Structure 1
């Protein structure tokens, strides 16, 4: 196996999707970086900087045109001619996220929209915003760019959803080639672009407190772990994720055990899941 080149571009992100990836257990992030992918551009962790880092990405992109994977973290703001997200400068000219996605988007093998912001707009697109924050797939489509997009949402996603999707795609490509493998990846996506291995089961239907929900036994304070969390605001009933089973951070907790689910993987997050602390 040969580690494919990956560029990780951040738009209107919080870097939470990079940090969650650093928490991957099996494989560890060291193994991902040294054995699974070749992370050629990533502003948070790479050695080089500035125009030199941009030029390096461009040189790899030219050499591996059609073959590199493009990870997008954050939404893409279109208002004000892209000025709400400037990601770099080269040749004495600023590079907006709009510009960058139009440059690299057409030439990637596939775009992985990591996190709810990139997948669906997320908090930057929520009520009260004014930057034109746009989801990756919509931005690409609006600009005539047909490159396949896989959504890996969550705010943040679990590391296993990101790494697992990368591995699923690379394994499909090993088996059926680039075009055939990407066609197989698209077949495992739901109607919101999400891989069904991680997003095909509903939290509530699989929740350990479902018996209490059915019995009408509800907690009135967060620290009462006996009752169902519905009255405290749990959005498990309308959320598709496998958190009930893999849990978070090495299996030590998850949102429903600790507090409530806020529906962070869903296309309407946050506004359609708010208020968070009532039903």
Structure 2
């Protein structure tokens, strides 16, 4: 049978959001591209290059008009008329707005496209902004994290394919199955927080008993996500806090890349 089409464009990306797919198991990246979708444009994996791959993109935008999912990783730089990211001699903001015109659904994968992320931090050298800021007339589905667990993306695409609509979203257009709860309101170290059992430095006695990381700067009290339950890499038991390091707030605008690692979170 025919497979649902996808167009993937990278703006000011590090490629970590594409690389998340190479850790996925349900589906694996080979089953995603041979069975689940038709990946019509993706510069990291494409056999074609240069003029051939730009022709392939134009052909797919015409053939699949009103049908494809558009995915963007990385921030979009507006300073100096778009010149901080140029592909085929044109500002990436122009490639993204052209591709958005015919999209059935639009997804910002990662903190950079969802809210500006690391590339928009500090002084913001390039005037980097979010995908929603460049497409004010469109509903952008945000899948934040640096990078997210790849299944936060893959189960969102599967809901669009299988049931013909997006998953339920919060007021930041994030899927509720993945972002509907604070990490601290579903964390297995909450008993230690409640008892005042805290690690004070890495390698101290409390740290070596798996105690709460709040006083090392854990941002779980102010970050929405599924890192304590879904976790990462499908091996069991693997997320930052379980390994021994505080959450940094990478999902959440104003927390990750703004607050210091050891700065304390506000608690509701």
Contact 1:109 1:148 in 2 (8 A): no
Q: In the alignment, what sits opposite 1:82?
A: 82
Residue by residue over 1:142-177, the C-alpha shift from the partner in whole angstroms, topping out at 9 and shown as x without a partner, is: xxxx3331111100010111111111121221xxxx
Q: Residue 121 of structure 1: which of 101, 106, 116 is its match?
A: 116
Q: Write out aligned runs for 1:59-78 (5 A).
A: 59-78=59-78
Residue matched to 1:160: 151
* Deviation of the 1:269 alpha carbon: 4.3
Q: Which of 266, 273, 278 does residue 252 from structure 2 map onto?
A: 266
Helix, strand or coil for the counterpart of 2:106?
strand
- Paired with 1:39 and 1:159, the residues of 2 have a C-alpha distance of 16
Q: How does 1:88-237 map to 2 (within 5 A)?
A: 88-89=87-88, 94-141=89-136, 146-173=137-164, 181=165, 185=166, 188-223=168-203, 224-225=207-208, 226-237=210-221
Kindly indicate whether residue 45 of structure 2 is the aligned counterpart of residue 45 of structure 1: yes
TM superposition shift of 1:36: 0.9
Question: 1: distance between equivalents of 2:251 and 2:34?
Answer: 29
- The structure with the greater share of residues assigned to helix is 1
TM-score by length of 1: 0.89
Correspondence list, 1:19-38, <5 A: 19-38=19-38
Report what 1:176 is aligned to. Answer: none
CA–CA distance in 2 between the matches of 1:59 and 1:39? Answer: 13
Q: Which residues of structure 2 form unaligned runs of 5+? A: none
For the residues of structure 2 that align with 1:268 and 1:105, how far apart are their CA atoms?
27
Give the equivalent residue in structure 2 for 1:278: 263
Q: What root-mean-square deviation, in Å, do the aligned CA atoms of Structure 1 and Structure 2 show?
A: 1.4
Contact preservation (8 Å) 2:109, 2:153: yes
> Which deviates further from its counterpart, 203-212 or 250-259?
250-259
Specify every segment of 5 or more residues in structure 1 that has no aligned partner in the other structure, as ranges: 174-180
Q: What's the CA shift for 1:278?
A: 2.8
Partners of 2:250 and 2:257 within 8 A in 1: no
CA distance in 2 between partners of 1:277 and 1:235 (Å): 9
